[PDB]
Structure formats: structure tokens, C-alpha cells
From a paper:
Hsp90 is an essential molecular chaperone responsible for the folding and activation of hundreds of ‘client’ proteins, including the glucocorticoid receptor (GR). SHRs, including the glucocorticoid receptor (GR), are hormone-regulated transcription factors that depend on Hsp90 for function throughout their lifetimes. Although FKBP51 and FKBP52 are 70% similar in sequence, these co-chaperones have antagonistic functional effects on GR in vivo.
We obtained a 3.23 Å cryo-EM reconstruction of GR:Hsp90:FKBP51. Contrary to our expectations, the FKBP51-containing structure appears nearly identical to the FKBP52-containing structure. FKBP51 binds the folded, ligand-bound, rotated GR using the same three major interfaces (1) FKBP51FK1:GR, (2) FKBP51FK2:GRHelix3 and (3) FKBP51FK2/TPR-linker:GRHelix12. However, in the GR:Hsp90:FKBP51 complex, the FK1 domain contacts GR at a different angle relative to the GR:Hsp90:FKBP52 complex. Thus, the FK1:GR interface is distinct between the two complexes, specifically at the functionally important, but divergent, residue 119 in the proline-rich loop (FKBP51L119 and FKBP52P119), which we investigated further below.
Residue numbers in the entry:
A (entry chain D): 13 to 421
B (entry chain C): 519 to 777
C (entry chain A): 15 to 225, 283 to 701
D (entry chain B): 15 to 225, 283 to 703, 724 to 732
Amino acid sequence: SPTATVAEQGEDITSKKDRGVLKIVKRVGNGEETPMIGDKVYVHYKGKLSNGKKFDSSHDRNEPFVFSLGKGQVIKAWDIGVATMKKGEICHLLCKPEYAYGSAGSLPKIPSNATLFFEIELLDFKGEDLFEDGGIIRRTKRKGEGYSNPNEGATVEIHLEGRCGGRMFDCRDVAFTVGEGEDHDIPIGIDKALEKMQREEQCILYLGPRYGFGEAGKPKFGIEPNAELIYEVTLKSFEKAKESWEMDTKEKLEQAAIVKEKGTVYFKGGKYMQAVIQYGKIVSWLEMEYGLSEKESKASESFLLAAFLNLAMCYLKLREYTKAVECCDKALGLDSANEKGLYRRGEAQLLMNEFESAKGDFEKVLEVNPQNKAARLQISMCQKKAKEHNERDRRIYANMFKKFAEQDA
Amino acid sequence: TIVPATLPQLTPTLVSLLEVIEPEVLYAGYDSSVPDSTWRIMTTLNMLGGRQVIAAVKWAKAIPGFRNLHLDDQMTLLQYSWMSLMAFALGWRSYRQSSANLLCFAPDLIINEQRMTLPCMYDQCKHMLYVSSELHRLQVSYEEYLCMKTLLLLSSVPKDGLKSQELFDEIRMTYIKELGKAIVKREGNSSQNWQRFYQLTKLLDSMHEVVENLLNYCFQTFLDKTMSIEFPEMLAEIITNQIPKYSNGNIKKLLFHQK
Amino acid sequence: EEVETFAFQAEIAQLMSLIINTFYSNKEIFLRELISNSSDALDKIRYESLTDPSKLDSGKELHINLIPNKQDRTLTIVDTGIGMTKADLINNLGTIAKSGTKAFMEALQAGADISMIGQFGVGFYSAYLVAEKVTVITKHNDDEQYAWESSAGGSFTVRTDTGEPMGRGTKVILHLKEDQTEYLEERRIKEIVKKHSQFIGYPITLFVEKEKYIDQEELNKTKPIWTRNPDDITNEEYGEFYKSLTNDWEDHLAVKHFSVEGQLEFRALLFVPRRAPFDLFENRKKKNNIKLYVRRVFIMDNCEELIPEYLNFIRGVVDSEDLPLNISREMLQQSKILKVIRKNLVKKCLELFTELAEDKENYKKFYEQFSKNIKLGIHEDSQNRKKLSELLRYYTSASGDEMVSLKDYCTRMKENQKHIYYITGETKDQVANSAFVERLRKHGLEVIYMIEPIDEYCVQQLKEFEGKTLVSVTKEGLELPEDEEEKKKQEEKKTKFENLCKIMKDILEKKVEKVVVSNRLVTSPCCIVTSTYGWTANMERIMKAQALRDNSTMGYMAAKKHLEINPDHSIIETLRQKAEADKNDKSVKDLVILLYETALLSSGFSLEDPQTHANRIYRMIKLGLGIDED
Amino acid sequence: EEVETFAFQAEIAQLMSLIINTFYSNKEIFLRELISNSSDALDKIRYESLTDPSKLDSGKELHINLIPNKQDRTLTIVDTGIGMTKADLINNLGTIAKSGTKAFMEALQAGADISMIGQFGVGFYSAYLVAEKVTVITKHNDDEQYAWESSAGGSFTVRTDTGEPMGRGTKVILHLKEDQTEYLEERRIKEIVKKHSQFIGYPITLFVEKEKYIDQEELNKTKPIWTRNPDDITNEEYGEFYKSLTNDWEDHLAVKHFSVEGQLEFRALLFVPRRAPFDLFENRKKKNNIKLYVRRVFIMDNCEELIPEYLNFIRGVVDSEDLPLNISREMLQQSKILKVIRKNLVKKCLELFTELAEDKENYKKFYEQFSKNIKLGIHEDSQNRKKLSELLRYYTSASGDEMVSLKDYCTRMKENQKHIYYITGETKDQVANSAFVERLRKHGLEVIYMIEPIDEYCVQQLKEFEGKTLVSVTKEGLELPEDEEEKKKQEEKKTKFENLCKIMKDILEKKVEKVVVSNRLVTSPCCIVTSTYGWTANMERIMKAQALRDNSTMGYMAAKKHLEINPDHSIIETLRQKAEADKNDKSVKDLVILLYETALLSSGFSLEDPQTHANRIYRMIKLGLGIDEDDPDTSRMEEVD
Ligand SMILES: Nc1ncnc2c1ncn2[C@@H]1O[C@H](COP(=O)(O)OP(=O)(O)OP(=O)(O)O)[C@@H](O)[C@H]1O
Ligand SMILES: Nc1ncnc2c1ncn2[C@@H]1O[C@H](COP(=O)(O)OP(=O)(O)OP(=O)(O)O)[C@@H](O)[C@H]1O
Ligand SMILES: C[C@@H]1C[C@H]2[C@@H]3CCC4=CC(=O)C=C[C@]4(C)[C@@]3(F)[C@@H](O)C[C@]2(C)[C@@]1(O)C(=O)CO
Ligand SMILES: [Mg+2]
Ligand SMILES: [Mg+2]
């Protein structure tokens, strides 16, 4: 059995000389010859146990095995593996028991030392992942602590190269807080990228069209690739954000007042993303049980309702009536007569071409405030738009049955 | 005139659906050059715990019947039984990986008897190994095991009940029925199936003690500050919110079987 | 003619063989019989002690001990009953078909309450079903201890007992057959005792060895509470009894404790579960659930003859006295008796449900689990439809989410109604919003929404309720209490629309029996309606979905279809005008098809093309979307 | 010590009572026993006459006569068998457990072929189930005639018979109970006799007075044939027998005649009818139409233990001469015997079906009537599933119009075709033209068309044929052996329309689990498929329609709908571009819904509320025809807080 023969054969790939990995690789194909590091790399493979036994597993279905982390994660044999893997390489790397199923093993089914090698056809391994929402390309040099990351509310110390997309901007080591994504012109998506970064993590961060200032066209950067703001960022230190379950009842009310003012400013400044962020913190705190008396609970409701309504407007400008609708619904669940929410939701509906719901909301605005002519105007507009749509249909569909009868020659 | 047709029975799939839903085991461990100090062991376990606990949430969401519960209740059940489920998962993995009453947590994490160095384990070995020893003694299979695991998800309620109670009760009977079937088709017995069912139920009922005692220890580890232990925010939030529910008696235990 | 007279004789050797080899179907019963005789022995002494307490001077505890002995491969059964004198060991154990018990009973005063297990004189001998040798040790108060022994070879012996004193009572020792050792196991014993003898009045203790010491385990802990006057039993007691009886954990939902004192005498407890029963553990599929006991001894548990299947969710016990039984005591003689019992069981089940229903919340809990069975009882068991139907509950248009009784529908009827209107369909919502009920809603008439597949089977039998006729609103010929002026208008409409009726029939020739002008629709231009005699769309879809089929089933049950036209509809007026202007306008042809086809779906029929429907729509979409022909 | 030894005794009075009152439940069997005694009497003389022919000098006809007498409430049974001498008369009728028959056989040499019915010694007394008194007159060749007479009073008498000579044999007269005259009626007799005798080796004549004269009818004209060597029986003979037994004007379709030797002796005949019974699965009476006889005497019927229900259409008889019976001879004593019988009967039925299948014409006739039973067997019988599957026949997309074998399928399959594909649905037309098979047909792959609702059960359990698994073409993940170039082209298509997948999903968030780009379609703009697990279309509607079911299970088992889009349809391409231009375009929203509703109908799902689909259509008609007649403070909104 050739797969058993190779159990003790191969070139030396080591960490440990008496264990390690046997390079029994049959060939290198079609792809870059450089060993590569990267995420979401899918490979196909078939194989056998080091003792020559056919393995009863997913390789017989050509499983598209994925390498989830840049330097590997779930198969010690293949992660030790990635370090020497090339695109197009057809690997046969037999890794001794320390790389098999671990100290526990996968027993009851598989003993810890029942190792394998497979004929693995490799996909390009260069490059780590981007982002769940897209907008950023992340590449790493050094892992951080692994037990600690910034969370919004914490100031962080970030080393910045000064570089950005082959160009320079006011990129400097910064004792960054989240509001700075807009206040200090620091690419805005950094606000969330930092929460995944671990202390002392070294990562190259590309901030794309909506993650960076591409769409904004900020002249402050003045970088032709304003939409590709890529440079090294190192998270060197940070403080700990106090969590909403760590913060006290009064502490959360106090911060809601502080944050509310920041949010108001951001809103007015056109910094709707930051306004949303500040209002986001306000709402998540306020939604929690505080143990307040009935009159004290109104400080919470006041901050909460205001945040919903401010968010609704931020979203009316940032998003096409999506979260804005939800915010209004929340504002109205809290206060069914708040004409601001009734009105703003009604606009969100009209602006999505939902004429019936828009009219209903504006009618409600006027029950609360019969003099709020804004709703009266919106109702008239809803009616007019509905008329326009009805006319378009007549232009297309009128007398189609005849058209069809004649086409049918 | 008309005779209603009889009904052939469709392949029951709840057990195989659960087999599909169950997640793969996660890795945990630490740099072996570091001794297994009280705080290192706890840290390794805490990080694994938070990751396994979140996997348990999507796992629960994926379960037929469960998924139709009001979301608040779905999350309530996960908190109240998070310990039950984790302990059960551990106990089974242990005894199947080895007949020894060890704790098998991850591909790289085993706590053998000589490694039960945490004060918490020394005091709770009688509870954490209650479960692995008993499942071993009864030679519990994977499938009847899964049926029981699901019932543990459904083993506790608020003292004030759930909103979708008239579903919850259905879901429990549904999985009770599946457990019965899981036993009958494998044992080949009659009166002994009745008894095996009760013998297994008794684990799940006695596990209420297993959990309160283990629970109080996890509360103590998180609450005090005597050990250099990192904890994930997830578990820390759960415990912060769970401690007063426990101490106020707001969590009700369910009794699965008598007779 | 001198005539010789002879007595009858018997051959003992063969008689013994029949006793052992051709009366019994099983071996469980060897224990059952030994225990029964033992309990009678105890009861006899208990009785004697009533007038002479000194009878118990030799010992007062009346109990039965089962003592298996694996090492010796034996089983010993011990009691403290009367015991036997030397004379009785010889007469009663040495005589086939002698019955000491019977003689005892015969010798009793008329007022005696000794509900003795009666007997034939054969049963002891069943011991040899499992034993190679049987030894009986006994002490009677009036005699010495003696040891009786036999291998049933046509003799037996009597020895003076020189061993340990008993005080009083009988000890039976079986020396078991080499290959039947399961009777030495705890599990087998417990199953047998529980199954046949759990209601014997004297405590039974099983003595076994474990780490060593002997574990004394009582088995018959439950009392046969049905023997008590019903008024003295609390709900907790019924509940506990029930749980032990059925190995449940839930309590009963309802119970009826009933007795009969006529030609036959018996008592029974019938329980209604709080949850529909299910096969938690393997059993005979659809075994019925009423057990029959005679004199507190289990006799039979799956007698189909006792109760209709629709009432098989009732759990319960019937305990009779003095029924003629088969020699094996496994079966009842004269099955005409079962017929009588069934009559009474059903009669009382109905009273229970009638009463249960007074509690609206509980009725709901009931009905949610058990409505299917009620409905089967309508379909079947025709003599009871008149009462069962009152237990039905339905959603109606005026009920919102409440279900109401048919009597509620009735009380709310208008003076012009002669009929109860109902509609059937797949879901609530599809029925409630249907075109078929638009004019009924207009005039404020109540409609019943029938939903379950079962409802279609059932509706066929329920022709009349309290004198009102039940009618469907999906059949042609629906009668509404309309005025003369509208009727005249309808005729005028027929006159102008008949041209379409004919044209549409020429179109679409094979799809309908006819096309008519209708007075039932408001907003729909049309619908598909069923014939007066025939089957509805719902019936067809049900029949076409069943596992059990024939060709004749639908060759016979297929529905006829008729197309109804809303005269008052704007599409319809357009067609009248267009079609009259040109009978061959091909666009009319296509419009006729879409109205029909759409009507088919909206009326509950499967669309068989089905692709053609989709294709017509795709063409319309291309236009709507601005996609040209090429 | 001194040990006394005693014999066992019996109390005759009680013994007599028990035999009469507790051993039997069916009074009618008294006739069965009187006849059995009689046939033994005849057979015994026949045996003796084999070596000594003078034994029959006293009379040569061996027969049984039944002579009811209305007028005197009596029944007489007459035979010409050995008869009894005075000594035998007293010893055998006066001893409760004596069996002369048993002794007789014991007195014979090994090799005698004769098999008697009796052996217990008590059957005679069953006469008293219906008789008040009985009289027995008998003549033995070696003695005079004697008349035995008694009530079951503990004693009996013997008289010299001073009446007419009977030549030879025994005459039994019952004086019937005043209330038991139903057994005196010609109809009832004949029915009992038919039921319990049927295959008695000697003829029975029933003598009935009519306007008078006596009508002498021979009962049991039909002889058992299973006792004969099968090689010796013509097909017509089997058919004649069959028709007689079943009152079937039609002949049998197939028959299997076999025997089993060793431990339990068997002979059996199994017949396959040419028509399925109309109530085959509906009758509420027991389904196994197999009768069990012992020594040619009927014992039992309607026993579930003998045959699995799926084979409840086989008509037949099982006969043995060695099984233990209870005292009434109404059942076997050891139920484990039935287990063995069943194993063998089933094995042979399957052999018969296999043989039948070789005749293509006959198999078709069979299958047309009984394919339901085969399919049920697949569902219920886990052991013979592996053979039963060979008997299935289905229409396929490449069979034209005849049904073919699963083997036929797999012998036409293509080198890269690793899987067997099938579709299920209401009718052949619907499946044949379904969107789901458009690519498969285009590539030349064969699809099995399953139609019956029961087909849905077989597809669960069959799983694979000769290692080739089954694939439903209505589920997600359908795999075709596509080329690399084809895959690359699809990869590019799949990075397009992503926005549509998302937009449509938002529109349909509450309707579908997913919206994806697909490849099973080549003509049609879209379709609905079900995910890997759960009920599929058809399976779900079937379950909903079951008359009796637990509806709560439908909250667990239900389809998970995925919407597949055909990227190379013009509707789809237009929407792609249009939707990208405006995410809220009202017309996009409206058209997406119609495609969805349409796809459900064409995909085999019911539609949730038809009075919407219809309304969408009605307004389109009105536009199409031009029928438009009925279808023609503010600053607070800006405030920031
Ligand atoms: N344990 C005992 N103690 C005292 N007397 C006994 C005992 N067992 C049997 N006998 C006596 O022996 C007699 C023999 O009756 P046997 O018990 O054989 O009938 P049976 O088993 O009651 O009959 P059946 O099976 O019809 O119920 C009884 O009538 C009784 O007087
Ligand atoms: N018509 C008859 N002619 C000759 N002998 C008879 C006749 N009827 C009865 N006998 C004799 O009486 C004996 C007793 O018969 P009986 O029917 O009681 O016993 P059995 O047939 O063994 O009972 P079972 O049918 O239960 O086995 C027979 O063995 C036989 O010798
Ligand atoms: C006594 C408690 C109970 C423990 C846990 C019991 C259940 C469990 C099962 C597993 O498969 C993995 C981790 C956990 C979830 C656990 F092992 C660890 O997290 C550490 C733990 C909380 C504890 O040991 C601590 O005191 C640490 O705070
Ligand atoms: Mg007795
Ligand atoms: Mg006889």
C-alpha cells in the first residue's frame, strides 16, 4: 500500500524533528510557487490513513474544505500544511500524530494518532478575509493577545504608517475613540475593524468606497484611491469599554445624556454615521432593565425615544427607508402619538412607493396634530403619485388582448 | 358506504434532523509550556465555553418545534439550561472518548483525574462525573443521547412560565416520544424499555442538583477576583444576568418522570 | 329385556396428561394459580377468625411470600392461611376435580361476604407445567405438620413433617425444570404478578438476595378503589390510582365511576386522559384499552367486542363477578355477554362527555385532543349521531376565534332560514374569504367553516339538525330568501346574457356541463360550482390523495362542474357586447379561457395543465415589463 | 420414616360437568366431533379389510349419512365403520379419558398409513352440548347389536338391541334440547358442515324430506387435492378446486403447491386471483384468507400471525398432521409454531411472484391489480425489501407507454450517471411537462415518473438500487454531470443577479428561505424547490389530506421553499437591469410577486389564498380591455434630538 509506505518517507518539514511533517507531495501545478497565507481557501481532496487504511470520511465526496484563518485553524495537519502550500500544488503531506486529532482526539470515532495524508488540489492561498459587510480587505502580520479587543467606548492607541493607497493622508499614531472616524477624518470603517483586532495585532487595512472616503470624495485625503485606503495599522493598546451589563443604572442614564449630545452634534454636522453610532449606544443601554422607579424610568424613555427619532432621520438620509422605518416603529411603539415618528415613517413609506401605508401614517399625524400641514401635503402627494402609476399601466396594458390576438398569426 | 383509509406511518425524522443539526466540536487548549494552573485551566475552559455556548444558540434555533417558540422564550431556555446542556455534552463526550471519568472538551483538551485541580472540580467531581459515569454505566447511545439533550434544552422554565407555553409542552412531549422510540428500537425490550426510559430520565431530573451546584461555582469564579482568569464577555453577561435569577428562585426545574 | 347399568369411570393417567398438556396456552399462569389459591386460603382464615379469634393465636399476619432460590433451582410460596389437615392433603390434592374451596363456599351462611375465587377442582396441577417435582408443607391448627409430595406420576405420598415449624399455613415448593429458569428472575416475576394479580387484597412480598442480604420488596401496593363507594373517593385518590394504573404522570382529565346491578353485575372506572394517548413503548398496534377483571383477577385486555374503536382513548377497568369462564380462565364463555357490556359502556361514555362539556375550558382542552374521535363516531355508530353531534364545535363567520355549537347557530337563525349554511375547504382563511360566501355575507347570514378532511365524511350523514337542513354553498341551486323584484331582474339578466352562455359553452366545450347566469357572486366575475348530486372539490381532492384507491372510486366520485357568471360584473358586460358583435372574435375565446381557469383555482380545483396557466401569465408579464415580441 | 403412598383419584361428577360446560364455547362443533369419530370408524375398517377382505362381507359402502328429523327433535348420524362390541362399547363410552382410537393406532405396526383424528377420549361428550339424551346403536362383525343409552347423569345403560339389523357400523341418535332446534335445520346443517368438514375422505349424504320423497344431497363433492403429489395435478384441476373453494367464476392466475418436511410437516396451496378484491384494504374483518387444517379438519382462520398483511390477497390452505392443539381443538397450543409457518409462507409467495414475472403478459395483468401490495410490502417489510423492489414497475420519460423495471433503468444509464433520478406528482402529464426536468431531458437523462401517493413511501425507504442512490428532482442540490466550461459559465452567471437575489429576497423575506441562481431550468423563468430535508411538495399535500392525523406534526415537518431563477430568461434579465436602476420601483415589486405565485402553482404547491391571485388577474384583464369605468408645525419633522 503506497500510502502506508510513505508513513516514514518524505522531505523534512519541521517544528519538531521527530514528529513534524513528511513531504511526500507528488507535484506542483498551475499557480503561484510562493507558499501562501490566506482565508476562505477551498480545496478538494482524497486520501488514506498512514497505516494504509482507506479513510471513512468527507474526502470521498471531494469536500470543498475551507481554510478559515490565514495561518490555519481546524486541521493541525493542514494548517502546519498551509505554511508550505502553493496554488496548484497537489499536496500529499503526511503529518505525524501531533497534527492529527489532538490530545483528546476525535475518539469515540477516531483515535488521536490515526493520521492521514490526502491528495489535495489547492486553491489560491494568498490573502485573508475581507469583512462580513464587505468594504475592507484585511491582511495580517502579527496576531495580538487573543483575549482582548477594543469595544466601542474604549479609547485605543493605533499606530498608523502615514501611508494610504500608495499616497499619504493625516495618518498618524492616534489615541482613537469611535467619534474620530468622522471627527478626525480617520477612515470610518476603522470604527468596527478595531473591534475584531486584538491588542498588538498588526494588520493591513484597506478601507473601500463606503468604508473609506471614496464615495465622500474627501479632498483632505486627496488620494486618487480615496476608495482604496490601504495601509498598515497596528493596535498597540487600549482601555476597556464598560459594558452595558457592567455599567450601573445611573451610569447608563448619565452616558445616555452625554452621548445624546454627541449624537445631536454629529447629526447636525452631517456626520450621520457617527450620530447613529452614538444613538445606537443610547438605545442599547436604554432597552435594558434599569431597576428605576416609575418617574426615573422616564429619563430612560426620553433618551430612548429621542434616539429612535434621531436615528430615523439619520437613516432617512443614510439608507433608503430601511432602518428608518424600524426606528419609527420603535418610536411609535414607545409613543404612539409622537407625530414626528408618525410623519417620518409615513415618508419612509411614501418614499418606497407604498402609497397606502404612507397615507395611513400621514392621516395618523393629523389626528395627533390636525394643523400639521406637512402631513396634509404628503397625503395629497401620495394620491397624486398613485394616479401617475395608474396611468402608466393604462398606457401599457390598454387593449392588450387585441394586441395578443393579432400577434397570434 | 365510505370507509376512511388507514394511515401508514412516515419515516420519523426528528432524530435524524437533530443528528444533522448538532455542531462539530471546537478546538481549545493552550501553550503546553505553561503549567495547568488553576487560572489557566479556567481561562481555557471559559473561552471554549463561550464559543460552545453560542454554537448551542444557533443549534437550538435550528431545532423543529423549538424554533417556533417566541424568541424571548427561546433565549430564556438557553440561559436557564446553558449549564445543563454543556455538562451533558461534556459527560457524553468523556465517556465515549474514554471509559475513564475524565472530562473531554475539545480535540486538544482533556482533563484527566490527575488534572482535576480546580477547587471547583474537587468539590464538584461528584456532579460532573455523575453525568459521565451514569451515561457510561447505562451505555448510552448517541441518538437516545440527543433526544435527552433536546429535553435538557426544555428542562427549565421561569417560575412564571413561558409565553408560548402551549407550544413548549408540545415540544417536550414530542421529544419524549422520540426518546421512547430511540430506546425501543435499540434495546428490543418491553418492560425494560419502560425502565430504561425512567433510568435515563432520572439523570436528567437529578441533574438539577448537578447544575445548581456547578452553577454556584461558576458564579463564584466569575464574581470573585482571586485568579488570573480571562472570561469571554458572553459568559460574563450571562452570569451577571443569571446570578439574581438563580438566587431569587426565578428558575423553575421540571420533573420529567415518576412511575 | 334385562338392562345393565354402569357408572362412569376415568383413566387417571390420561386425565393427568390433559391437565398438564392441553389446557393451557402459556406458563405465566402457573404462578397466577398458586397465588390465587393462596389468597383464598388467607381469606378463609380471616373469615373464621371473625367469630373465633383464637384461630390466629398461631400467627396474625396475613400475607404472601415469594421466595425464589436460584441455588437450588426452586421456588417457594408461603402463606399464613388456613393450611390443610392430613385428611385434606389426601382428599383435595389427590383427587382430580375435587374442590375444597367450593365445598367451603357451599357450607357458608347465606349472608357471607366471602368473595372467594371460585374454582373447578383443577389448577394446582398447573404447577407441573414448570416443575419436575412439587412439595407441599402444611400446618393446620387442628393437626400436625405434614409433607405432601408428588411428581404427578399417578401417585403422591404423605410424610410427617419433621422440619421447622410453621405455626400455621401452607408452603409450596417447586423444584423446577432444568430448562425453565426465567422464573427465578426478578424481572419475570414482577411482570407476571403485576399483570395478573396486582389487586389481590393481601400483601405480597418478594424476597431476593443482593449486596449480602435479603431485600424484601412489596409488589401489590395499589388498592382496587373501584370497590369503594364512589362518593368517598377524592380526586387525588382517583388521580393516584390512575397514574399507577397507566404508568402516567399526568392526572386524569375526567372520570366516571359507574356500576351495574341487573342480570349482570359489575363496576367500572372510565378515565379520560389529559393528553391524547400514544405508543410511548411498543404494544399491539391499536390495542383497545379496557381491561376486564373477574373477582379482582385479570382476565382479558383486548376485547374488540367491548367498545367501538372511536372510544379507544378511554382507559379503564371493568370488574365483574360470576361470569361463566372458560376452563383455562383466559376467556369468557357466552360472548353475548360482551354485547351487553358494550351497550352499557358506550351509554355512560356519552353521559360523561355531555357533562364534561358544561365546563367550557375543560371542554376545550378535551376537544382539542379528542375531536377526531367524536367525528368518527358520527360517521359510524349511526344510532348515536343524534347525541354525538351536539358535542361538535365549529368556527363560524360570527364567532371570530371561538368555536360554537350547532345549537348556537340555530338560535341565531333568521326567521327566513330553513337551512344551515356551511362551506368546506382547506384552511380557515381560504374559506372565510371565498367568493362563494359573498352574498351570504351581504345579507348577514351565518356560515360554518368546515376544515378538516374528516368533516367531508361526516357531513354526508348529518343531514339534519334539530329539524333544519344542512346545505352547502359550493353547490348549484343555493337558495337564498330573495325578494320578487330581484328575481325578475335576474330573469331579465338571463335573457340578455344567454347569448354568452351559449357562446362560452361552445368555447371551452369539454370543461363544463353548462354555463349559467348566477345570483351568488358580488365581485368575482365567475366561479366553479358543484352539482346538486355529486361531490365537491374538497371531496375530490381528498379521495385523490388517499393511499387506498381504485379506478371506480373516482369514476364514480368525480365531480361535475358548472360555470357561474356574475352578470353585474364589468368584465362580463364587456364580453356580452363584444361577443355579440363578433362571435368569432378570437380575443373573446382567450378571455373566456382565463376567466374559467382562474375560477377553477379560486373554487378549489386542481389545475391540471398546469403549465399553460403559467405561460399565459408569462406572456402578460412580458408586456407589462416592456419586453417586446422579438 | 413410614411414608404412605396413594394413587390419584378423580371425582366423576365434577369431571363430567366440566367437560360439558367449560371446555367448549361454540355449540355447533358438536357436529364436527360426531363426524370425526365416524370417519375414524370407517377408516379403521378400511384398514383391516386390506389384508382380510371378508371384513366387508357385512357391507361394502363406506359412507356417512346425516338424517335430521323435525318431528321428534332428533338427529341421526349413521356410518358403516368398525362398530363396537359390547365390551368395547362399555369401556370406551364409559371411561372419560379413554381413547380407543389412540390405542388402536398404538396397536398398529410402523408403516401403516392411516391417520386418525381422535386421541383425547372426551370428544364424544360434546354431544351433550346440544343433546338432552343420546342413544348409540352398534354392530360389530364379531358381536350382536347393542344399544347404549344415557343422559350425562353419572351412569349409562346397555341393552341388547332388539331392533333392525344394520349389517355393520354405528348409529348415533341425539335427542335434542328443546331450544336447540336450529341445528336441526337443513340450512344450518349444511353451513356447519361446509365450514368444519369439507375435506373428509368419505362422502356425506344429507337426507331431506321434500314434496313426499327424500332429497339425498352429497356434501363435500370436492376432494382435497393438496394431498396429492403436485406433479400429477393438471392446471385445470387446480382451477376447478379453486373455483369451488372460492365461488369464483374466474380461474386462478397463478398457484404454488408445496410441502415442507422435518419437525413440522406441511402441505400448502397458495393461489393468486385474477382480480383484486374490491375491499382488499377496506374490509374491517381479518385480512389473512388462509385456512389452517390439521389432519384435514378445519381448525383456524383469520389469524394475523400467519401472514404479513401486505400479502393478504393470497388465498389458500395449510395442512399438517402433527401440531398440538388445545382441548377444544380450536387453536394451536404453541404460538412459536405460527412464527415458523409465517416465515415459510412468505418465502414461497415471493418465489411465486418472481416466477410469475417471467411471463411478461401475465405479470402485467397481475401488477395492474396488485402493485399496491408490493409497494406496501416495501414500506413494511424490512427484510424482503431487497427482493420486493425487483417487482416494481414504473413509467419513465424514456419508456414510451409501458412500465419498466428498475433494472431496465439502470442498464440504460450513462457512464457518468451516478444517480437515478425521479419525480413524483399527481399525473403523468404534469410531471412529464414540468419545469423541473427541463435540463435533464435536454441532456438525455431518464426520469422515473412516480404517481401514486404510496410511491412517496417507497422513495423514503428504498434509498438505493444496486448501490445507485435515488435523487428527487424537486429538491435542492440536484447534481448533473456538467462540464468544466459549463460550470465556469455558471460561475460567472452566479456573480450576476446577486442584487436580485437580495432584492427579491427582501420582497419575499416572509415567503422563501432562499433566492438563488440555478441551472436545472432551461426554458421557464423560475421554480420552487424544497430543501434537502422535510416534506416535499406532494408529500406535504398528501399528509394534509389524510383523514386522520396529528396536525401538530405539521409545525415540524414542512417544506422549506427555495426560489430558483433562470438567468437566461428574458423576464429575469429585464428585471435585473430594472431593479438595479431602482430598488423601490413599484412595478418590480408587483411583478416579482406574480412570478412567485405562478411558480408555486407550477411547482406543485397549493397557494395560500386564491382570492388574491385571482384579483391580480382581474385587474389585468380590466386594463387589457380598457375597462376603466370602475377603476379610474411642519418644522417638527426637522427637529433634531
Ligand atoms: N395454599 C393452600 N392452602 C390451603 N388449601 C389449599 C391451598 N392450595 C390449594 N388448597 C386446597 O386444594 C384444593 C384444590 O383446588 P385447586 O386449587 O387445584 O383449584 P383451582 O386452582 O382453584 O382451580 P381453578 O384453576 O379452576 O381456579 C382447593 O379447593 C383448596 O381447598
Ligand atoms: N361411530 C363410532 N364407531 C366406532 N367407535 C366409536 C364411534 N364413536 C366413538 N367411538 C369410540 O369411542 C372412543 C372415544 O371417542 P371420543 O370422540 O370420545 O374420543 P376422541 O375422538 O379421542 O376425542 P377427541 O376428538 O377430543 O380427540 C373412540 O376412540 C372410539 O373407539
Ligand atoms: C464549576 C464551573 C462549571 C464549569 C463548566 C461545566 C460545563 C462545561 C462543559 C464543557 O464541555 C465546556 C465548558 C463548561 C462550560 C465548563 F467546564 C467550564 O466553562 C468551566 C466551569 C464554568 C466552572 O468549572 C468554573 O468554575 C469556571 O468559571
Ligand atoms: Mg383451587
Ligand atoms: Mg372423538
